[PDB]
Amino acid sequence: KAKCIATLAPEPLVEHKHRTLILHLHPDHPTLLTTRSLGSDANPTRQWIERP
Amino acid sequence: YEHTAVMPNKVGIPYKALVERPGYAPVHLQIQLVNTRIIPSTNLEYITCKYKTKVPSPVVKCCGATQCTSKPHPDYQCQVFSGVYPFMYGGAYCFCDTENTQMSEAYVERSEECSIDHAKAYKVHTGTVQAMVNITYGSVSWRSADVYVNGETPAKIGDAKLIIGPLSSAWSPFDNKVVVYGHEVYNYDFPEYGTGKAGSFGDLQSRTSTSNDLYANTNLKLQRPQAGIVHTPFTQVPSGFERWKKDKGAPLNDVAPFGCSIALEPLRAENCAVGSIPISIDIPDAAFTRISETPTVSDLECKITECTYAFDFGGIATVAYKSSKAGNCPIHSPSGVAVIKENDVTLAESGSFTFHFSTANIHPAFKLQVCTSAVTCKGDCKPPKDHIVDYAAQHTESFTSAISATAWSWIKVLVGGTSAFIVLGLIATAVVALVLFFHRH
Ligand SMILES: *[C@@H]1O[C@H](CO)[C@@H](O)[C@H](O)[C@H]1NC(C)=O
């Protein structure tokens, strides 16, 4: 077991709307985006973002 | 003095209450959970990892024949290939053209990586629930200790004895079977030991990473060596562990409801905001001061100067008062209509003080307790400007919290008019019925 340096994707641009979160993702490499609700239904989302 | 109440199972949101001991001035009590950990009991079923194919030197019998024998090795394969004429660097190995046999042997072993790169399959059963509780009361600074959320085991926190009731919800994010790989936990109904299929998760199963009995189920099949070459070719189904690592999917860390955070040492689900937690705290008798020894507050008048029903402490209020024996006096709002930011204020013989509060009601109306006295605060609150915030709501929203005075007026007009229409029709019917009766009589 060793410690490896992993890439850190660019910080997303975040725009806010009524009950809506808008993220503008500009990855350098295929970057995994995951989300989940904090309620009784996680409603998870998982997708790889390869381009803006 | 024992104070009993019920607090919501929220982390980072402090619970505030006034401990009212008859004959003594109220003592402000604040209980905040630092973390909540559901620690289930787990039994390691087996360890899965990438297999290694060990292939001993083939027995090349020249001008003769050999026979394979069974051996206690995982997925052991042995086959005698007759009619080989192998060549080495020094020329033809065997003399006879076809009366020669090569006996190939192969068996499966745990790879070196299996010591570090392996998945642990666990059976999960109901375990225990623990929490870290942060408590402050009166003039005693914040103190914390680990407690058991079972309603039985008491904990001593800053001379106060705390008993935390069991969670009202027995919900747990772990199923009866979980797979732990690295830092991630997966809800996976792994195959029973000895049942793993080739090329699947359980292709290689071992009761422990250091056991001497390994289950291996791969289509390890020895192929005939190429003409004239001394080697042991074989075909095998690619490791089902590597495949799994490709197709693991979303881990429990990313799909657990209620915002649970999964940790592995020990396996647990942290900060699950499920249900509520009964509590009972015995405050030391030395923390209470007699009523006659504390300031008397009267002529309270509460004015809301600004309010927005934001998740933060968007409300601001100013309270005018008259008192005596200038000194500290706790502030608390017993109803859920508003959450008060300040815990206590300094009162002079006369003047006013301000406090901040968070409320979800468009027209908040809440009682404010000023030690031995109380006042009613009323006002109007504006909508919040920020659509999204990075902090949880301090207040609690009720069914009628959003109904404005105008909405109530329209509901009253609707119900009153509708009812009046039916009532008037029924009264007219009764009157005409009586008139007809008098007509006959
Ligand atoms: C308890 O709360 C106080 C104030 O919020 C803080 O200073 C203290 O560090 C907390 N205790 C722990 C264990 O975090």
Side-chain angles (χ1 to χ4, degrees):
Chain A
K1 298 298 300 189
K3 309 295 287 291
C4 287
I5 313 167
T7 54
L8 196 61
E11 195 72 14
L13 294 169
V14 187
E15 293 184 325
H16 301 153
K17 295 293 183 182
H18 183 237
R19 295 180 182 171
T20 306
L21 177 76
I22 302 171
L23 300 177
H24 305 281
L25 307 168
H26 308 285
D28 296 301
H29 313 288
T31 300
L32 181 62
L33 177 80
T34 55
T35 76
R36 61 171 173 168
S37 173
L38 302 177
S40 65
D41 183 2
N43 187 21
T45 300
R46 183 170 191 275
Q47 58 181 306
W48 286 89
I49 311 301
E50 303 187 357
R51 59 148 287 144
Chain B
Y1 187 76
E2 183 182 1
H3 174 74
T4 59
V6 179
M7 67 178 290
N9 184 11
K10 296 175 184 181
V11 175
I13 302 299
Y15 165 84
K16 300 186 183 192
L18 289 182
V19 180
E20 298 182 47
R21 181 182 180 198
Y24 302 85
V27 170
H28 191 275
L29 168 69
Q30 185 174 0
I31 300 171
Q32 181 183 309
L33 301 177
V34 178
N35 61 62
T36 302
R37 315 184 296 271
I38 297 171
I39 308 170
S41 173
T42 58
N43 300 112
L44 180 67
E45 190 69 29
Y46 62 79
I47 283 180
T48 297
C49 64
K50 187 179 179 172
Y51 69 73
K52 181 181 68 172
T53 307
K54 181 60 185 181
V55 181
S57 300
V59 185
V60 186
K61 196 73 178 179
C62 304
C63 299
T66 198
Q67 319 72 38
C68 280
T69 68
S70 66
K71 293 185 183 173
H73 304 295
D75 204 5
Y76 182 81
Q77 312 301 321
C78 190
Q79 191 164 3
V80 187
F81 310 100
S82 69
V84 303
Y85 197 73
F87 294 89
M88 302 296 292
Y89 81 82
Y93 190 76
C94 299
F95 185 99
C96 301
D97 301 292
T98 62
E99 305 75 359
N100 324 307
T101 77
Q102 184 185 310
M103 190 174 72
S104 297
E105 300 186 51
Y107 58 95
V108 180
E109 301 186 334
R110 292 186 297 270
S111 73
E112 298 72 13
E113 305 77 6
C114 289
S115 66
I116 72 168
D117 191 28
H118 62 256
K120 296 185 178 181
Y122 289 100
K123 288 282 182 65
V124 187
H125 307 287
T126 301
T128 187
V129 182
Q130 301 182 18
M132 173 71 74
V133 190
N134 203 2
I135 295 190
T136 177
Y137 61 88
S139 61
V140 179
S141 63
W142 290 90
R143 290 289 300 274
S144 64
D146 274 297
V147 310
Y148 290 85
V149 179
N150 62 23
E152 304 296 319
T153 304
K156 192 179 181 180
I157 303 177
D159 304 324
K161 187 178 181 179
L162 177 76
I163 295 171
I164 297 297
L167 305 184
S168 69
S169 179
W171 180 89
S172 177
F174 306 106
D175 285 342
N176 63 314
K177 283 181 175 178
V178 305
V179 173
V180 179
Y181 176 63
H183 67 288
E184 294 171 336
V185 184
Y186 298 83
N187 279 328
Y188 187 74
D189 184 8
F190 54 79
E192 307 301 333
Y193 184 92
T195 83
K197 297 178 181 178
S200 192
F201 177 75
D203 65 356
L204 197 78
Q205 305 168 331
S206 185
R207 287 293 188 183
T208 179
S209 62
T210 61
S211 69
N212 62 335
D213 187 1
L214 184 65
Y215 171 84
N217 187 12
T218 81
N219 299 337
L220 181 56
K221 185 172 182 177
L222 299 166
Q223 300 297 338
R224 189 183 178 85
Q226 296 294 305
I229 294 147
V230 181
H231 73 158
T232 306
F234 67 85
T235 51
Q236 191 173 23
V237 165
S239 178
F241 184 61
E242 287 288 315
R243 180 196 173 188
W244 181 75
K245 286 193 291 177
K246 298 184 180 68
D247 302 325
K248 299 192 274 70
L252 185 57
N253 307 43
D254 297 344
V255 307
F258 301 105
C260 300
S261 177
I262 308 299
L264 296 189
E265 296 180 354
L267 174 68
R268 64 194 187 271
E270 301 195 343
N271 308 340
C272 301
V274 291
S276 67
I277 310 181
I279 58 169
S280 173
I281 183 164
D282 188 338
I283 303 298
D285 60 317
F288 296 92
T289 300
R290 294 176 291 184
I291 289 287
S292 63
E293 295 177 308
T294 63
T296 297
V297 186
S298 66
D299 200 25
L300 292 171
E301 294 184 352
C302 182
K303 176 180 177 181
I304 304 303
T305 63
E306 179 171 354
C307 182
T308 179
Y309 53 90
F311 282 14
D312 206 339
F313 294 97
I316 310 176
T318 301
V319 181
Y321 68 88
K322 291 185 175 70
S323 189
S324 64
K325 302 181 182 181
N328 191 274
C329 158
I331 299 296
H332 180 59
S333 173
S335 62
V337 170
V339 181
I340 313 306
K341 187 177 182 180
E342 290 79 5
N343 299 328
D344 59 70
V345 297
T346 300
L347 304 181
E349 285 76 9
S350 65
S352 67
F353 69 86
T354 65
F355 69 87
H356 305 75
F357 66 95
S358 181
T359 186
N361 295 286
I362 190 163
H363 296 288
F366 62 92
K367 180 180 180 180
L368 189 82
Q369 289 178 291
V370 187
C371 41
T372 64
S373 298
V375 64
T376 303
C377 300
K378 299 186 181 181
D380 301 340
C381 300
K382 298 181 179 180
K385 69 183 181 68
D386 301 331
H387 292 290
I388 303 291
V389 293
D390 60 329
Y391 47 80
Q394 293 291 324
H395 55 59
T396 302
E397 185 180 6
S398 299
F399 176 76
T400 60
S401 291
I403 305 174
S404 66
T406 302
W408 280 123
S409 181
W410 288 116
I411 292 166
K412 287 176 182 179
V413 170
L414 170 71
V415 175
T418 299
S419 180
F421 299 155
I422 293 170
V423 167
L424 289 171
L426 291 172
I427 290 169
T429 299
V431 171
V432 68
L434 290 171
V435 170
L436 291 170
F437 168 85
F438 286 114
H439 281 161
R440 293 195 299 275
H441 299 270

